[PDB]
Amino acid sequence: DYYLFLLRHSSLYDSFYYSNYVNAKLSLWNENGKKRLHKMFARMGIPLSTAQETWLYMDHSIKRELGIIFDKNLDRYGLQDIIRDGFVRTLGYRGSISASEFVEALTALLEVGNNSAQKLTNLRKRWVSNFWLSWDALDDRKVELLNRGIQLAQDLQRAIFNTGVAILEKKLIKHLRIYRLCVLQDGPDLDLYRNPLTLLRLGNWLIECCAESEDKQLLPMVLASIDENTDTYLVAGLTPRYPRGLDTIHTKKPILNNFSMAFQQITAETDAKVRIDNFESSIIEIRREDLSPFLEKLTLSGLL
Amino acid sequence: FRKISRDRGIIDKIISSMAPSIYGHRDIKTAVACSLFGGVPKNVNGKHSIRGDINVLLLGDPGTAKSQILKYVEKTAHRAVFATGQGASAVGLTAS
Amino acid sequence: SVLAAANPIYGRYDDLKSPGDNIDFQTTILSRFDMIFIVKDDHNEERDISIANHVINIHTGNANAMQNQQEENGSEISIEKMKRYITYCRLKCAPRLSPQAAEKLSSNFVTIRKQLLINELESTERSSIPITIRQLEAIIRITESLAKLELSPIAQERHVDEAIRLFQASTMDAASQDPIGGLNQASGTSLSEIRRFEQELKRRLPIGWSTSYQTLRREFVDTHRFSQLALDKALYALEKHETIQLRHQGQNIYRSGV
Amino acid sequence: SQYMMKAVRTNPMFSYLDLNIKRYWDLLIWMDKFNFSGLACIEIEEKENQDYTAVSQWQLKKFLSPIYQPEFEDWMMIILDSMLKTKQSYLKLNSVENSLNGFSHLFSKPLMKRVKKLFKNQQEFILDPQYEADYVIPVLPGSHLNVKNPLL
Ligand SMILES: Nc1ncnc2c1ncn2[C@@H]1O[C@H](COP(=O)(O)OP(=O)(O)OP(=O)(O)O)[C@@H](O)[C@H]1O
């Protein structure tokens, strides 16, 4: 299999387009990356019309020789790391599913499915409710729910890409000495980032984009998102990651997350209106008024 | 294009480059440039369509180089059509 | 069915001129329309700000991010669902009137046809928007259409009231343009009698205190100055926002300003 | 003033009214009867430069945080002085009352720096429980607004 997003349930062009690794290695958010991808597809010998067809209805001859075409061409563009081995499960005259696609469908089912304290309580209740929707999809009898999860995953990844290009083009990322800050205050569809998993998706997109950047640094990142209804920011701290294909000389116990201790230290000393109640200690909910001072304290906190 | 697009004051130079030999009438040149570059059409949920083109009107005294500006716009535009007065009909500007 | 849209002569309605000089459609074509809507702009600031915000939300992308939610919850349905509901309702139901509905409709027809006679006699010219038997059949059709929504097999007074209100909002409003002044032969003596009565009323009644319509009729008519058209003269004076106010169920006439 | 008093009293409509002038104002800032400031003299004298007293009654100050109430008065005392100076300059030199054009130029630059410093101090000390005595919005009869940022 390949490090491609939902290959067997979408086109080949879509799989190459919405991939974190390909986007990091080719910078598809601007025009140059799209032109480079078109040049690659032209060189490989696959017509642009054929690469946009559904996987089931794709040409048999092209599908048969995909491995050789990948092996002989992927090295020129630095994408030789997309080839790997995985696990594929098939049940009768139904169709093949890979483990990666299954976990993305499950995550999509988790994310979307189905006076401020009550507002937060209803959101948490819906998040609890989504658990049974994800639970039902593990049974072989309920395949329509798995298909629904696949569609939801496609839509969610499209939204993440759309937000990420806006973040990257306007230079919203601010490089402080200790960490890198990104606060999303205005824009469309900020109601998708009230869920921690969607913000983790966007953070994984940004970290993947930064890891392959020629700039050599390992600073942690802070991602903040506003909810108008609750007037609260949801703030998450994300650890840096080494490049995927880098050697094992640096390999060790991975970089440690130090945001929990810093958040507890700042919360204890000052009477900030923060909520640290999630299982993940790196995700907090801070009132709108306290965001700008609190972060300043974090700048002097250290351990980051 | 991408090199000269990041210079500050590109809009001023673009406006100044419209009909260079005509003197003055900078508001007309700004309107012509805005019409030439154009807006963005929109469709909201596939049921509500919003136009994205700018139309311009020039009402003025005789001898103020309006027709020469129209000829310049005809020359610069990728697709241009010209008509005048009584030489056009109801179905000559429409489908017949 | 026919859905038509048009503009008046001169572009805007030009409320200063007569309705007959504004609508170029003849009586023959205007009698085949069940509902006629005359649309005007009022240029209010609050409405302008609300519309501006609504339009800007459409352009900035905030529209869809809201609409889906309501379409999801309980308040809106998609185009295809509404299409299927329309076809199911049209192919399944065809309601009928009740004996009380006919009685309520006949009286409304008599009222709306009487009013036209007074309007035409006062304006001494024929009405541009006509009221005929087709206007009764239109209200019957609207009542049955309202009944069709609920798949009800009978139309009752609940639907009749809403049909009557819709007809009043659509066609009776267009017919009753109520010209403030046309300077025509109608109310020709009133061209001076209006100013005469205004002066006589403003000299009798200082900026405070009130009077009654009963007295303002009896005493000012004992001198034989009655014109039978003074009902709207008080409202016209009220339109100045200073001369006249009506209070206490319309009995009390209060002088409020210059 | 005497001519106006005589003219008003001469009219038969107001023959029995009692009119007395209480104060003369040189520069007056009027919002309502409870919010005003300026420079006034009780009565004008002869051959002596008129003594002027400066008054400032601002109920608007009462709804501010204790740390900013002195600043409100201090900055109003600079606004009034600058306006008086520019009015004197305009009088000496000779649609718009040109006596008061350009008074803001004298106190703009200090005000910007003071606002920046106050904002920095607020960011530093707003979350400190020791300084909780400051930055407390008072509750007064007739107060309705629910507001968040004291320096704003
Ligand atoms: N700055 C200028 N203003 C006006 N006319 C100018 C100027 N510079 C040059 N001209 C010349 O003046 C002449 C008058 O222009 P033109 O014929 O377009 O006038 P017009 O009254 O707008 O025309 P028309 O009636 O055909 O629309 C042209 O030959 C034009 O080239």
| Contact state of C61 with A188 under an 8 Å Cβ cutoff | yes
**Method by which this entry was solved:** cryo-EM
* Chain C residues near residue B42 by CB distance under 8 angstroms: 59
For residue D7, give the 3-state DSSP assignment.
helix
How crowded is residue A70: how many other Cβ atoms within 10 Å of its Cβ?
Answer: 16
Residue C140 contacts B, CB cutoff 8 Å: no
CA atoms within 13 A on the CB side of A243: 16
Which residue's structure tokens are 């000390």? D125
Asked if chain C contacts chain D via 3 or more Cβ pairs within 8 Å, the reply is no
For residues A50 and A110, the answer to whether their CB atoms sit within 8 Å is no
Counting as contact any 3 or more CB pairs under 8 A, the partners of C are: A, B
Nearest CA in chain A to C69: A191
CA terminus-to-terminus distance, chain A: 37
CB of A289 closer than 8 Å to CB of D148: yes
In this structure, what token pair is assigned to residue B88? 């056009």
- Say what the resolution is, in angstroms: 3.3
Question: In terms of Cα–Cα distance, which of A185, A193, A196 is closest to A292?
Answer: A185
- If you search the block for the tokens 């810093």, which residue do you land on? A262
Provide the β-strand partners of residue A98.
A88
Phi, psi of C77 (to 5 degrees): -130, 155
DSSP state of C105: H
Packing angle, helices A117-136 and A99-111, rounded to 10: 150
Site from A267, A296, A301 to mutate, D interface, most D CB atoms within 10 angstroms: A296
Q: Do A292 and D123 touch (CB under 8 A)?
A: yes
Termini Cα distance of chain C? 53
Rounded to a whole number of angstroms, the distance between the first and last alpha carbons of chain B is 41
C67 touches chain B (CB under 8 A): yes
Q: Which residues of A touch D148 (CB under 8 A)?
A: 289
Q: How far is CA C117 from CA C34, C108, C113, C187, in A?
A: 20, 15, 7, 17
| Interchain contact C80–B (C-beta under 8 A) | no
Nearest CA to ligand 1 atom 27: B67
C-alpha atoms less than 13 angstroms from C-alpha of C217 in its C-beta half-sphere = 9
Shortest CA gap C67–chain A (Å): 12
Which residues are CB-contacts of A257 (< 8 A; sequence separation ≥ 6)? A220, A237, A239, A282
Q: How close is the nearest chain B Cα to the Cα of C64, in Å?
A: 7
Q: Cα of A186 to ligand 1 centre, how many Å?
A: 49
3-state secondary structure of C209: coil
Angle at C161 between CA C156 and CA C163, to 5 degrees: 95
Q: For residue C59, what is the nearest residue in chain A, using CA coordinates?
A: A188
Helix (H, G, I), strand (E, B) or coil at D129: helix
Which chain A residues contact residue D127 at CB under 8 A?
270-272, 290, 293-294, 297
What values do phi and psi take at A234, rounded to 5? -100, 125
DSSP-assigned letters across all residues of C16-44: TS-GGGT----HHHHTT-S----------
Report whether residue B26 contacts ligand 1, using a CB cutoff of 6 Å.
no
| Chain-chain contact of B47 with C79 (C-beta, under 8 angstroms) | yes
Residue A294's Cβ-side half-sphere holds a number of Cα atoms within 13 Å equal to 26
Which residues of chain A neighbour D126 with C-beta distances below 8 Å?
293
Please report which helix (H) or strand (E) contains residue A223, including its range: strand A221-227
Dist. CA B87–CA B27, nearest whole Å? 29
Q: How far is it, in rounded angstroms, from Cα A274 to Cα A104?
A: 32
> Are residues D28 and D100 in contact, defined by beta-carbon separation less than 8 angstroms?
no
Q: What is the DSSP letter of C172?
A: I
Q: Which amino acid is at A209?
A: C
DSSP class of C13: -
C79 touches chain B (CB under 8 A): yes
Strand order across the beta sheet in which C210-212 lies: C210-212, C252-254, C245-247
Centre of ligand 1 from the C-alpha of residue B33, in Å: 19
Q: Could you tell me how far CA D3 lies from the centroid of its own chain?
A: 31
Tokens of C74: 């309980």
Q: What is the DSSP letter of A2?
A: B
Of A208, A205, A207, A209, nearest to A220 by C-alpha is: A207
Written as six digits, the tokens of C134 are 């087709």
Nearest CA in chain C to A190: C65
Nearest CA to ligand 1 atom 25: B62
Question: Which pair of structure tokens corresponds to residue B72?
Answer: 């310049």
Taking the Cβ of residue D12 and every Cβ of chain A, the question of whether any pair is shorter than 8 Å is answered with no
**Looking at chain D from residue 121 to 140, which residues have their Cβ under 8 Å from any Cβ of chain A?**
123-124, 126-129, 132
Helices marked H in C168-243:
173-175, 190-204, 213-222, 231-239
Encoded tokens for B84: 């005048």
3-state SS track over A18-79: CCHHHHHHHCCCCHHHHHHHHHHHHHHCCCCCHHHCCCCCCCHHHHHCHHHHHHHHCCCCCC
Q: Which residues of A fall within a CB distance of 8 Å from C62? A: 188
Q: Is the CB of B65 under 6 A from ligand 1?
A: yes
Asked if residue B63 has its Cβ within 6 Å of ligand 1, the reply is yes
Token reading at A205? 């997109």
SS3 of residue B39 by DSSP: coil
Q: Is C61 on the interface with A (CB under 8 A)?
A: yes
Which of C54, C58, C76 to mutate: most B Cβ within 10 Å?
A: C58
Query: Best of B25, B57, B68 to mutate for ligand 1, by most ligand atoms within 8 A of CB?
Result: B68
Cβ partners under 8 Å of residue A22, min gap 6: A3, A4, A16, A28, A37, A79, A82
Which residues lie closer than 8 Å to A93 by C-beta, 6 or more apart?
none
3-state secondary structure of A212: coil
Q: Does C58 touch chain A (CB under 8 A)?
A: no
DSSP summary character for residue C97: B
Closest by CA to B2, choosing from A34, A30, A168, A165, is A30
Q: Are strands A221-227 and A180-184 parallel, antiparallel or unpaired?
A: parallel
Q: Which H or E element spans position B61?
A: none
A293 Cα to chain D: minimum distance (Å): 5
- Cα atoms in the 13 Å half-sphere on the side-chain side of A301: 23
Determine whether the shortest distance from the Cβ of B22 to ligand 1 is under 6 A: yes
Measured CA distances, A191 to A110, A116, A122, A202, D61 (Å): 15, 16, 14, 14, 40
As a whole number of Å, the CA-based R_g of chain A is 21
- In whole angstroms, how far apart are CA C105 and each of A75, C137, C144? 84, 10, 13
Q: How far apart are CA A287 and CA A273, in angstroms?
A: 6
Residue A204 contacts residue A169 (beta carbons within 8 Å): no
Residues in chain B: 96
Minimal CA–CA distance to D44: which of D36, D52, D34?
Answer: D52
Q: How distant is the Cα of B53 from the closest Cα of chain C, in angstroms?
A: 15
**Residues ≥6 apart with Cβ < 8 Å to C89:** C148, C149, C151
CB atoms inside a 10 Å sphere around CB A282: 21
How far apart CA C171 and CA C38 sit, in angstroms, is: 9
d(C-alpha B67, C-alpha C221), whole Å? 70
Q: What angle do CA C41, C42, C47 make, to 5 degrees?
A: 100
* DSSP state letters, A72-115: HHTTTTT-GGGB----EEE-SSS-EEEHHHHHHHHHHHHHS---
Q: Which element (helix H / strand E) includes C108?
A: helix C99-123
d(CA A25, CA A211): 10
Interhelix angle C62-73/C45-59, rounded to 10 degrees, is 90
Do A287 and D148 meet the contact criterion of CB atoms below 8 Å apart? Answer: no
Nearest C-alpha in C relative to A114: C72
* Shortest Cα–Cα distance, B20 to chain C (Å): 35
Whole-angstrom Cα distance, residue C61 to residue C38?
32
b/e sequence C44-54, b meaning 16+ C-beta within 10 Å = eeeeeeeeeee
Q: Is B85 in the pocket of ligand 1 (CB under 6 A)?
A: no
CB spacing of B44 vs C64 below 8 angstroms = yes
Where residue A179 falls (left for φ over 0; alpha for ψ -120 to 50; beta otherwise) is beta
8 Å CB contact between A73 and A82: no
Instruction: Give the containing element (helix H, strand E) for D126.
Output: none
**Residues in D 105-124 with any Cβ partner in A closer than 8 A:** 123-124
CA A56 from centroid of its chain's CA atoms: 27
Of D115, D105, D14, D27, residue with least CA distance to D72: D115
A143 in Cβ contact with A95 (< 8 Å): no
The DSSP secondary structure of A106-148, one letter per residue, reads HHHHHHS----HHHHHHHHHHHHHHHHHHHHTTSTT--HHHHH
E-only strand ranges, B28-96: 42-44, 48-50
Q: Cα(B67) to centroid of ligand 1, in Å?
A: 7
Cβ contact B44–C63 (<8 Å): yes
Mutation site for A-interface testing, chosen from D126, D134, D147 by largest number of A Cβ within 10 Å: D126
Query: Which residue's CA is the nearest one to ligand 1's atom 14?
Result: B63
d(CA A174, CA A159): 23
**List of chain C residues whose C-beta atoms are within 8 Å of the C-beta of residue A191:** 65
**Residue C23, by phi and psi: left (phi above 0), alpha (psi -120 to 50) or beta?**
beta
Residue B45 and residue C58: Cβ atoms within 8 Å?
A: no
How far apart, in whole angstroms, are the C-alpha atoms of residue B27 and residue A1? Answer: 61
Can you tell me the distance from the alpha carbon of D23 to that of D21, in angstroms, rounded to the nearest whole number?
Answer: 6
Task: Look up residue A209 and give its two tokens.
Answer: 């984009």
What does the DSSP 8-state code read for residue C221? H
* C and A in touch (3+ CB pairs within 8 angstroms): yes
Whole-number Å distance, alpha carbon A150 to ligand 1 midpoint, is 65
Chain breaks in chain D (C to N over 2.5 A) after: 94
- Name the interface residues of B facing C (CB cutoff 8 Å): 42, 44-45, 47-48, 50
Query: Number of A:C CB contacts under 8 A?
Result: 6
Taking residue B42's Cβ as centre, other Cβ atoms within 10 Å add up to: 14
**Euclidean distance between CA atoms C148 and C153, whole angstroms:** 8
Query: The tokens of D90 are what?
Result: 């305009």
